[PDB]
Amino acid sequence: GSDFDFLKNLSLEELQMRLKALDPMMEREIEELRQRYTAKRQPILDAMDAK
Amino acid sequence: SDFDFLKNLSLEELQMRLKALDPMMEREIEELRQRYTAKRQPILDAMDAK
């Protein structure tokens, strides 16, 4: 990403492209985070069921 | 840690370990969302300045 000072000099169509790209990037990041925690929970969950 | 360690702990200890992950996850998700909202603003402002 860039700062406002650089962004303001981009075309409106380039800006809309940049704005739109944030959404799947964000969705990818949160998905990875959720999977990261699922993976953390799994061995604890199994350990509880193994008793 | 690994299942081979966790399997030897009490049910109460394991439940505590599960519950401990919750606010950590909550925090990191909120940080992720704030970072997205942040990234949007200078682009939105750049659009409105033109």
Author numbering:
A (entry chain A): 1 to 51
B (entry chain B): 2 to 51
What's written in the study?
Recent research into cellular homeostasis has shown that the Hippo signalling pathway, which is mediated by mammalian sterile 20-like kinase (MST, the human orthologue of Hippo), controls organ size in animals and regulates cell proliferation and cell death. The MST-mediated apoptosis pathway is controlled by its interaction with RASSF family proteins and the WW45 protein. Interestingly, all three classes of tumour suppressors, MST, RASSF and WW45, interact through their SARAH (SAV/RASSF/HPO) domains. We also elucidated the MST2 homodimeric structure and performed structural and biophysical comparisons of the homodimeric and heterodimeric interactions.
Like the MST1 SARAH homodimer investigated in our previous study, the MST2 SARAH homodimer has an antiparallel helix dimer structure with a short N-terminal helix h1 folded toward h1′ of the dimeric binding partner. The main dimeric interactions consist of hydrophobic interactions of the nonpolar side chains and several inter-protomer hydrogen bonds. Firstly, the structures of the two protomers were found to be slightly different from each other in the MST2 SARAH homodimer, while those in the MST1 SARAH homodimer were identical. The distortions of the main helix h2 at the conserved proline residues in the MST2 homodimer in protomer A were 16 and 27° at Pro457 and Pro476, respectively, while those in protomer B were 12 and 15°. Thus, h2 of one protomer had a more linear structure than that of the other protomer. In addition to this difference, the hydrogen bonds between the h2 helices of the two protomers were not symmetric. When we overlaid the two protomers of the MST2 homodimer, we found that the side-chain conformations of Tyr470 and Arg474 in the two protomers differed significantly from each other, resulting in the positioning of the hydroxyphenyl group at the other side of the dimeric interface, while most of the backbone and side-chain structures converged well, with a root-mean-square deviation (r.m.s.d.) of 0.81 Å for backbone atoms and 1.22 Å for heavy atoms. The structural differences between the two protomers in the MST2 homodimer seem to arise from crystal-packing forces. In addition, the short N-terminal helices h1 and h1′ in the MST2 homodimer have been identified as typical α-helices, while those in the MST1 homodimer are 310-helices. Among the water molecules in the MST2 SARAH structure with B factor values below 25 Å2, only one water molecule mediates an inter-protomer interaction, while six water molecules in the MST1–RASSF5 SARAH structure were identified as mediators of inter-protomer hydrogen bonds.
